[PDB]
Amino acid sequence: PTVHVEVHQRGSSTAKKEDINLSVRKLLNRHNIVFGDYTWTEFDEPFLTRNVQSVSIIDLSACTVALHIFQLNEDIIAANHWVLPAAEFHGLWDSLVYDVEVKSHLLDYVMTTLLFSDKNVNSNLITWNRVVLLHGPPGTGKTSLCKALAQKLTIRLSSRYRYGQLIEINSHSLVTKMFQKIQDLIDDKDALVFVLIDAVESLTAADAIRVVNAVLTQIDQIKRHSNVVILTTSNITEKIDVAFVDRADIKQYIGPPSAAAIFKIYLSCLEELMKCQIIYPRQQLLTLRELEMIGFIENNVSKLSLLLNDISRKSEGLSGRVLRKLPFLAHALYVQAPTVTIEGFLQALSLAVDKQFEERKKLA
Ligand SMILES: Nc1ncnc2c1ncn2[C@@H]1O[C@H](COP(=O)(O)OP(=O)(O)O)[C@@H](O)[C@H]1O
């Protein structure tokens, strides 16, 4: 069995990754027994304190332990460009809460695609290509998940590629000049190059006819390369569109979150405010599973978690975008103070949610 361990090497570190590889594996033999996903940020060994920010075990270490040691990179006309792994995308993957194994299977699909591409599997005999489509209603994290997926793959494939690239083309819009810069990045075969075309449905809605055909033909060229992956998103979940998108061999529906997911999302927001001490004092909050084990009995330990559970349920229907914005509105409208008890914040969050749906009915 294989266990994955992501090692965040400090930007200021100059040590070889083989040295870090041996240090981290000594640390794991020390602790050796693991209960689940655990992350060390403080170390006793001074070589690790110097060169490693965090060691995270991610989903008894007699399994096969795979280390992924990476450094974050701290820093083209109509395109955004990041060198991967990018500091901007650090923590994005974990901030996206989907139902079980949406992100897992998506990672595995692209992993198999890259494996098949790397071994020159004949696609006439086994179906695969280099295009990925996430489709969903707007605000479900599709663009973020593409970026987070590109970051995960670069980190997980650090043995085959030395770094990654992400080019985000802004659909709202020389075309030869942009794809020349993309080809220069592809020319470096030590790099896994991701090209992200957001909301491709706007292309078929948009003189405008020539620009589209120019981009589709440029896409057809770069996808001929082994180190290229094309990520696309569509905010219309149902409709058919453009060839390379409709023929994408990986299609994933991304819908709005369930009440179970909303609960986790809110929990992550409340944890963050407690970490920053905007919510003070800190209090213990229960997960759904923990609530289910006590049959949802209302007592001092559970009262506030039950209240959050009920806020999550009347939040059903809202997108993730709105959900992670509501704690900001809750604080700005109903707290307006540097500090607030969790009781006060949950009440504020509840009002903010009601306000969202009042605004909704006015649009109806
Ligand atoms: N399922 C989710 N869980 C947590 N946060 C989410 C989720 N979906 C969206 N968000 C938040 O909304 C932000 C913007 O979403 P975005 O990726 O632009 O949506 P889309 O591209 O699908 O329109 C994300 O960066 C994220 O913080």
Author numbering: 19 to 77, 90 to 105, 119 to 216, 228 to 260, 272 to 429
Please share text taken word for word from the publication where this structure appeared.
We subjected human TRIP13 E253A mutant (which was deficient in ATP hydrolysis) bound to ATP and the p31comet–Mad2 complex to crystallization, and obtained diffracting crystals. Structure determination, however, revealed that the crystals contained TRIP13 alone in the ADP-bound state. Both contain an N-terminal domain (NTD), a large AAA+ subdomain, and a small AAA+ subdomain. This region forms a helix in PCH-2, but does not have visible electron density and is likely flexible in human TRIP13. Because the human TRIP13 structure does not form a closed hexamer and has a disordered pore loop, we used the structure of the C. elegans PCH-2 hexamer to guide our subsequent mutagenesis and biochemical studies. TRIP13 G320 is located at the hinge between its large and small AAA+ subdomains.
Recently, the AAA+ ATPase TRIP13 has been shown to collaborate with p31comet to promote MCC disassembly and checkpoint inactivation. p31comet acts as an adaptor to recruit C-Mad2 to TRIP13. We have determined the crystal structure of human TRIP13 in its ADP-bound state, and identified TRIP13 residues critical for p31comet–Mad2 binding and for coupling ATP hydrolysis to Mad2 unfolding. In conclusion, using a combination of biophysical and biochemical approaches, we have demonstrated that TRIP13–p31comet catalyzes the conversion of C-Mad2 to O-Mad2 without the global unfolding of Mad2.
